[PDB]
Design a protein around this nucleic acid. Structure first.
Lengths: 55, 74, 97, 57, 69, 126, 79
RNA sequence: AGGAGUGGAGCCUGCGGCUUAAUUUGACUCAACACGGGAAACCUCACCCGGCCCGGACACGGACAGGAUUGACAGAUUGAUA
RNA sequence: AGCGUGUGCCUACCCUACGCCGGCAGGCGCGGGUAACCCGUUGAACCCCAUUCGUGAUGGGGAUCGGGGAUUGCAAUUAUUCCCCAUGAACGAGGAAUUCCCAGUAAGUGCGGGUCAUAAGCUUGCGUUGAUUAAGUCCCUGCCCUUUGUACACACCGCCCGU
């Protein structure tokens, strides 16, 4: 039944396995340094995290 | 841009309903009318199930799902 | 939805024993960060929690991929009227006051 | 640490980017003293932001 | 002499397990494309090779216009 | 007339031996697809091939088989047998050869139907 | 168990941002101004600035104990 | 009266013109057109030859130990150990 | 030469240092690095050069497209994956229309981040070689600091006259 279907051929590159930790959005993800935010949420929270504009 | 236009096959479907009769006629019977009766199913020699696991009957490869056991003479 | 009654009573003693909880919305995924290894399937526990907090009589607030709950006394009254468990057995949460 | 992102939430307008920066400054001081002295000097009501790591190696 | 044997033109071809000798022009340029069996098999490869077009898929609408001029 | 050989070697005798030295007189293109390994859901195509091989009388065309397996082959014994594969919106069938190592099932489809040229007007014609 | 210093700094920033948003969306009515996380040896003390303090602590420190407990059970700190 | 490198000579994409499962949402000059950080098998395909596991804090209806749930290769399915 | 990246809340996915050996990434054993500690004084790269052009279709820069073991991604063909035989392509400043650009500009050239499964022809950065022309103008396209005209104010894509 359930085990006859699940976990048969590995999906090693799941885009749908990742989401923004603030709004749970699929797109515009920033996985660098482990932010795991979408780019809009990062722009909203960039100053609080510690990233600030200099150049 | 159009619609998916998924209409050319099966416009309407009816739900399948298994007519599982409430009376013990097809599944089991006694054919004795006495306190002691004969069982119409072969004894299961496997120890991987319980002591009251009784197998159903098909044309072959009696299907229970838990074991998928088939009588073979090797 | 699609929830059995044994899992219902399981999630109900969970609500009785915890009271104040935090959680995250997870359904499909088979292992859980902080509410797994509960001897009960993850999906049915989380769907029963969905029934608890979305049936229409206890409010919620969904943000930052996490859940924080205020469990009103209307829900407690509903529980006491249904399961007939008096509040005389106070939750152990009233320690370290 | 650099993170460069489009300024727009949509995909409209002139292609404009934010150039975000985060610089991590690392200093290490070496001296010979037992652990009690290090523990005492750490408890100095430190100012925020300076992460202190002590290793006996 | 067992000298490294990746120096001949058509190697590991069918019809022989070795690399035989041939000569004269008007014979080699054809055999640079051994297109008898790949046409006989009723394959898209025969027509891809025959029309002078791509067989691996070089893009041919804005760039990739060389081949007939 | 004698049958056309395969890379200067026969088939059945090599089909009776292991895979230790089977690739020494083959080509590329399944050079390592054979060496990739095995998983589940590989035997169905050969099973249907054998089923049509046994239920068809000798020297007669077997009935059409419907499937779309884009898989690999290791053994060329099935000379005389052809694979029926779904393509587009009709059926396609390809003549078979002992030249199975060096080509694939899915390299016979023309999905590059040419342009159906139009006669655009009204707007920018110049 | 261990992550690089870049990941560690980014994670600290994310923790600060999410904590600030959490106690912004909880008690914006309580005059909450901002949060400040102070490092202390093997400790994480948190200071909340608010214009109204009787309402963030409440009666018998109810609100404080509840939201401290949920922050505990949320942010992976030990018991 | 300057020029250099240009879109035409060496690594395909965006969207409209543009046969049926093919030209598929948002964006009509600069201020659309590897732009939605959007590198389309598929989880994100709505143009898609095809489906199933389906929803109601209530307004009203059909009524209880049976009123069906992804869940069998070999007679098949319309690719599919559905 | 970088600029930089590099391994558990989620999580099952990190960057890489010898041999099987055809001629090296490499299908398997192997250690190091949560990093100025290892990759790496950046592991299949200058632009140079006793393979060379004597006046330019030759050796000089590649029209497909075939083999040697394929990094291992069910599929790739209905986008992933090396150099060699020298097989000869208008083989030496470009319809109408034009886009960008003034010194470490342009252009050539590779490399790294993002996307990611080391997925780039994209973008964001980085070095490396290295720069003809111009230190001007309001002619074209526009902008601004004035004066002037207006029957325009939805503001010239305006308003408006005529059988």
């Amino acid at each position: 039944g359930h085990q006859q279907l699940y976990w048969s051929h590995p999906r090693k590159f799941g885009q749908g396995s990742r989401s923004c930790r603030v709004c749970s959005n699929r797109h515009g993800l920033i996985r660098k340094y482990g932010l795991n935010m979408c780019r809009q949420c990062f722009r909203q929270y960039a100053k609080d995290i510690g990233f600030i504009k200099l150049d | 841009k159009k619609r998916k236009k998924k209409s050319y096959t099966t416009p309407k479907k009816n739900k399948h309903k298994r007519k599982k009769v409430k009376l013990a006629v097809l599944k089991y019977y006694k054919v004795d009318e006495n306190g002691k009766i004969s069982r119409l199913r072969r004894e299961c020699p496997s120890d991987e199930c319980g002591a009251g696991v009784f197998m159903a009957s098909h044309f072959d490869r009696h299907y229970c799902g838990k074991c998928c056991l088939t009588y073979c003479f090797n | 939805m699609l929830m059995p009654k044994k899992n219902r009573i399981a999630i109900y003693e969970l609500l009785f024993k915890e009271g104040v909880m935090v959680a995250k919305k997870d359904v499909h995924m088979p292992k859980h960060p902080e509410l797994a290894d509960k001897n009960v399937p993850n999906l049915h526990v989380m769907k029963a929690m969905q029934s608890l907090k979305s049936r229409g009589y206890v409010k919620e607030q969904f943000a930052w991929r996490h859940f924080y709950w205020y469990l009103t006394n209307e829900g407690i009254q509903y529980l006491r009227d249904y399961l007939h468990l008096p509040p005389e057995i106070v939750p152990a949460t009233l320690r370290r006051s | 640490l650099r993170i460069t992102t489009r300024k727009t939430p949509c995909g409209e307008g002139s292609k404009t980017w934010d150039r975000f920066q985060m610089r991590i400054h690392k200093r290490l001081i070496d001296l010979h003293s037992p652990s009690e002295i290090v523990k005492q000097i750490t408890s100095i009501s430190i100012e925020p932001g300076v992460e202190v790591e002590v290793t006996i190696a | 002499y067992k000298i490294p044997d990746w120096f001949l033109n058509r190697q590991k071809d069918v019809k022989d397990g070795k690399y035989s000798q041939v000569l004269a022009n008007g014979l080699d340029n054809k055999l640079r494309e051994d297109l008898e069996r790949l046409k006989k098999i009723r394959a898209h490869r025969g027509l891809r090779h025959f029309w002078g077009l791509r067989v691996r898929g070089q893009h041919t609408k804005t760039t990739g216009r060389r081949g007939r001029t | 007339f004698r049958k056309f050989t395969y890379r200067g070697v026969d088939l059945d005798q090599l089909l009776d031996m292991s895979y230790e030295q089977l690739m020494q007189l083959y080509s590329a293109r399944q050079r390592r697809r054979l060496n990739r390994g095995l998983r589940r859901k590989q035997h169905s195509l050969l099973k249907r091939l054998r089923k049509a091989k046994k239920e068809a009388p000798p020297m007669e065309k077997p009935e059409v088989v419907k499937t779309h397996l884009r898989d690999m082959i290791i053994l060329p014994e099935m000379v005389g047998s052809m694979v029926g594969v779904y393509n587009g919106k009709t059926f396609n069938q390809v003549e078979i050869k002992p030249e199975m190592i060096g080509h694939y099932l899915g390299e016979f489809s023309i999905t590059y139907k040419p342009v159906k040229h139009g006669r655009p007007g009204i707007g920018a014609t110049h | 168990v261990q992550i690089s210093k870049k990941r560690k700094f980014v994670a600290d920033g994310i923790f600060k941002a999410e904590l600030n948003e959490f106690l912004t969306r909880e008690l914006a009515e309580d005059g909450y101004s901002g949060v400040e996380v102070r490092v202390t040896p093997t400790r994480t003390e948190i200071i909340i600035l608010a214009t109204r303090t009787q309402n963030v602590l409440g009666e018998k420190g109810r609100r404080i104990r509840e939201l401290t407990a949920v922050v505990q059970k949320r942010f992976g700190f030990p018991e």
